């Protein structure tokens, strides 16, 4: 139950899971606290410890604002934090199998939630499952969010950008100098991570620093190339600075702002972190990765087209409505308690709340594109088509775009297409296949029977539970035994993908092509 590590030894918990035991490590610190004159600074190295630390619970989320658009309701309150927050957040958890592996694949989860929120203490990102039933290792961590882990100031080591990638890349080392001690092999170490979770893989398979820290990579409703997961030079200088005026510590030194800005308290950082863009929408990230020239040397979409990245193996993929959740969060005539049928004149101003900065010619190609339906009748449409916007411009494209062009490369991908509405979703139905909620069927959830799924539930998630961890062995996400259909490889030309349900396994090819073709060729034009 006390494993050895190179700062010191941690003490664990056991865990009964489905009448075996699986061995927790929860709230493993990997890096100096980072506060007082190390906030905004980049993790250093943590102090090594002469006792035993106790790692028998999740320790504080990093600060973040949180979700109050539905209090009381498990739909949105299930993504807020269920630990403290605090600035002492750089932790990390390890669920290792029992009896204790011998050169088990470890499987690294990063979390989502806009690069503002999110937390590896979440029920959702619960690896006893994994470690369990395909006796690998899962490592996940907590990363800086926020203004607090992605102020960026170029240049400049007191506010350099990029802090919460870095905290992200301090743990994956810290896996590979210590999760020998904990039966896991470094050489076999797959990252996953879902929307900013997956564009932050996305960022590690471009940035040299991590090229040696993991073998492959997952990337679950998210990519680099998502046009909110790169903040600009520009934007985010002009942010900081808004920060800057907005709590009193406009300087001309501009070192001088960040040891101002080091001495407000974490809360008045985060309630003026909104308004440091002058207009919002659901999905606005105001402070995320940035060319920071440590972490990422280059505009990632010129690394990306110029093959510059790490070659290896990807598994891709998408939801089939990664828009709705976020309409019922600002869009007019849309709420999670009624059908939200809205109208023609509804839908142009659902664009103008996610397209705020957008020439009038550039929404109505959206609409043009998006609104010659098939028919006239059927009062759906404007609410379909307003997700389907939201959900192809933000997050779908990009992870083909992405999937394409690292392709070409000569390396394996394979791309999913998740389409399975969960029995349980507190939502409602018309918002779908939301965004975010493939990620119970990932971690085994419906495995455990007792948890209200169906038994088709449990099978569609034990089938995608084995394909990731075959992806993570072996570099190939196939189920073998059970007379399942086969993944093929995602090539640029024919760009085949496998949908993922409980009664249909099928092959399609070239997912969304005529709404994809508008996203990522005409529109970045205007
Ligand atoms: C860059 O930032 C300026 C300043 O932002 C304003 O001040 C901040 C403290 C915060 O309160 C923001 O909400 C403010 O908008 C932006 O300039 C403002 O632009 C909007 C309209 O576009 C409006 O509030 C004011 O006319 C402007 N204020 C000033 C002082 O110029 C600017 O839009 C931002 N973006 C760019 C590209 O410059
Ligand atoms: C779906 O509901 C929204 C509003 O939700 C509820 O209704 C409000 C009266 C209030 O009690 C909220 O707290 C509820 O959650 C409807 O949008 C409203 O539509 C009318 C139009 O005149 C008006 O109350 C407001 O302008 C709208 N509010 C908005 C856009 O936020 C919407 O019409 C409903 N749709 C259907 C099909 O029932
Ligand atoms: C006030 C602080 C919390 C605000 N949220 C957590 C934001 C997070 C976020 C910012 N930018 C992003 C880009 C891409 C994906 C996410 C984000 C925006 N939404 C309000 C998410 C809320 C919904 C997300 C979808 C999953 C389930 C339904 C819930
Ligand atoms: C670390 O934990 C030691 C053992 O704690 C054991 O496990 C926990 C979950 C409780 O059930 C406790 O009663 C058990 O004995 C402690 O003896 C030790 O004091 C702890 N040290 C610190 C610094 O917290
Ligand atoms: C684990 O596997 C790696 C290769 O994947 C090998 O180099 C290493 O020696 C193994 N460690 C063991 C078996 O303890
Ligand atoms: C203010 O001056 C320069 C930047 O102009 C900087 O090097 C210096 O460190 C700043 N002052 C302090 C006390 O850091
Ligand atoms: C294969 O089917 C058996 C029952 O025939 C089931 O117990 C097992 O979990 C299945 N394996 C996978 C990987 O789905």
């Given at each position: 139950?006390?494993?050895?590590?190179?700062?010191?030894?941690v003490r664990g918990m056991?865990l009964?899971?489905?009448?075996?035991?699986?061995?927790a490590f929860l709230g493993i610190?990997?890096?100096?606290?980072?506060?007082?004159?190390?906030?905004?600074?980049?993790?250093?190295?943590?102090?090594?410890?002469?006792?035993?630390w106790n790692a028998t619970k999740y320790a504080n989320?990093?600060?973040?604002?949180?979700?109050?658009?539905?209090?009381?309701?498990?739909?949105?309150?299930?993504?807020?934090?269920n630990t403290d927050?605090?600035?002492?957040?750089?932790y990390?958890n390890?669920?290792?199998?029992?009896?204790?592996?011998?050169?088990?694949?470890?499987?690294?989860?990063?979390?989502?939630?806009?690069?503002?929120?999110?937390?590896?203490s979440?029920?959702?990102?619960?690896?006893?499952?994994?470690?369990?039933?395909?006796?690998?290792?899962?490592?996940?961590?907590?990363?800086?969010?926020?203004?607090?882990?992605?102020?960026?100031?170029?240049?400049?080591?007191?506010?350099?950008?990029?802090?919460?990638?870095?905290?992200?890349?301090?743990?994956?080392?810290?896996?590979?100098?210590?999760?020998?001690?904990?039966?896991?092999?470094?050489?076999?170490?797959?990252?996953?991570?879902?929307?900013?979770?997956?564009?932050?893989?996305?960022?590690?398979?471009?940035?040299?620093?991590?090229?040696?820290?993991?073998?492959?990579?997952?990337?679950?409703?998210?990519?680099?190339?998502?046009?909110?997961?790169?903040?600009?030079?520009?934007?985010?200088?002009?942010?900081?600075?808004?920060?800057?005026?907005?709590?009193?510590?406009?300087?001309?030194?501009?070192?001088?702002?960040?040891?101002?800005?080091?001495?407000?308290?974490?809360?008045?950082?985060?309630?003026?972190?909104?308004?440091?863009?002058?207009?919002?929408?659901?999905?606005?990230?105001?402070?995320?990765?940035?060319?920071?020239?440590?972490?990422?040397?280059?505009?990632?979409?010129?690394?990306?087209?110029?093959?510059?990245?790490?070659?290896?193996?990807?598994?891709?993929?998408?939801?089939?409505?990664?828009?709705?959740?976020?309409?019922?969060?600002?869009?007019?005539?849309?709420?999670?308690?009624?059908?939200?049928?809205?109208?023609?004149?509804?839908?142009?101003?659902?664009?103008?709340?996610?397209?705020?900065?957008?020439?009038?010619?550039?929404?109505?190609?959206?609409?043009?594109?998006?609104?010659?339906?098939?028919?006239?009748?059927?009062?759906?449409?404007?609410?379909?088509?307003?997700?389907?916007?939201?959900?192809?411009?933000?997050?779908?494209?990009?992870?083909?775009?992405?999937?394409?062009?690292?392709?070409?490369?000569?390396?394996?991908?394979?791309?999913?297409?998740?389409?399975?509405?969960?029995?349980?979703?507190?939502?409602?139905?018309?918002?779908?296949?939301?965004?975010?909620?493939?990620?119970?069927?990932?971690?085994?959830?419906?495995?455990?029977?007792?948890?209200?799924?169906?038994?088709?539930?449990?099978?569609?998630?034990?089938?995608?539970?084995?394909?990731?961890?075959?992806?993570?062995?072996?570099?190939?996400?196939?189920?073998?035994?059970?007379?399942?259909?086969?993944?093929?490889?995602?090539?640029?030309?024919?760009?085949?993908?496998?949908?993922?349900?409980?009664?249909?396994?099928?092959?399609?090819?070239?997912?969304?092509?005529?709404?994809?073709?508008?996203?990522?060729?005409?529109?970045?034009?205007?």
């Amino acid at each position: 139950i006390i494993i050895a590590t190179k700062n010191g030894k941690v003490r664990g918990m056991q865990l009964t899971v489905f009448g075996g035991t699986v061995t927790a490590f929860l709230g493993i610190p990997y890096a100096q606290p980072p506060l007082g004159r190390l906030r905004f600074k980049k993790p250093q190295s943590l102090t090594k410890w002469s006792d035993i630390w106790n790692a028998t619970k999740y320790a504080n989320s990093c600060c973040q604002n949180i979700d109050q658009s539905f209090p009381g309701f498990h739909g949105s309150e299930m993504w807020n934090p269920n630990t403290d927050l605090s600035e002492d957040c750089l932790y990390l958890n390890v669920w290792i199998p029992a009896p204790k592996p011998k050169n088990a694949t470890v499987l690294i989860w990063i979390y989502g939630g806009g690069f503002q929120t999110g937390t590896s203490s979440l029920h959702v990102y619960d690896g006893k499952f994994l470690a369990r039933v395909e006796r690998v290792i899962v490592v996940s961590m907590n990363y800086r969010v926020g203004a607090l882990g992605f102020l960026a100031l170029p240049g400049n080591p007191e506010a350099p950008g990029n802090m919460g990638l870095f905290d992200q890349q301090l743990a994956l080392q810290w896996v590979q100098k210590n999760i020998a001690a904990f039966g896991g092999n470094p050489k076999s170490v797959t990252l996953f991570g879902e929307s900013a979770g997956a564009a932050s893989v996305s960022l590690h398979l471009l940035s040299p620093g991590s090229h040696s820290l993991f073998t492959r990579a997952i990337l679950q409703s998210g990519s680099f190339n998502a046009p909110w997961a790169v903040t600009s030079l520009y934007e985010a200088r002009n942010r900081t600075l808004n920060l800057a005026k907005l709590t009193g510590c406009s300087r001309e030194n501009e070192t001088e702002i960040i040891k101002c800005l080091r001495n407000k308290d974490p809360q008045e950082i985060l309630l003026n972190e909104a308004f440091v863009v002058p207009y919002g929408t659901p999905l606005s990230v105001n402070f995320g990765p940035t060319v920071d020239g440590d972490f990422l040397t280059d505009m990632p979409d010129i690394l990306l087209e110029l093959g510059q990245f790490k070659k290896t193996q990807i598994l891709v993929g998408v939801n089939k409505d990664e828009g709705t959740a976020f309409l019922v969060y600002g869009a007019p005539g849309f709420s999670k308690d009624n059908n939200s049928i809205i109208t023609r004149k509804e839908f142009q101003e659902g664009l103008k709340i996610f397209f705020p900065g957008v020439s009038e010619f550039g929404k109505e190609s959206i609409l043009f594109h998006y609104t010659d339906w098939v028919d006239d009748q059927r009062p759906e449409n404007y609410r379909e088509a307003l997700g389907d916007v939201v959900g192809d411009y933000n997050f779908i494209c990009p992870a083909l775009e992405f999937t394409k062009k690292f392709s070409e490369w000569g390396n394996n991908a394979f791309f999913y297409y998740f389409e399975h509405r969960s029995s349980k979703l507190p939502w409602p139905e018309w918002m779908g296949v939301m965004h975010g909620y493939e990620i119970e069927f990932v971690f085994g959830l419906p495995l455990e029977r007792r948890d209200q799924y169906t038994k088709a539930e449990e099978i569609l998630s034990r089938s995608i539970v084995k394909r990731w961890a075959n992806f993570a062995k072996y570099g190939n996400p196939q189920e073998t035994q059970n007379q399942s259909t086969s993944w093929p490889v995602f090539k640029s030309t024919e760009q085949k993908y496998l949908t993922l349900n409980t009664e249909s396994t099928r092959i399609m090819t070239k997912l969304r092509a005529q709404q994809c073709r508008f996203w990522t060729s005409f529109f970045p034009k205007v």
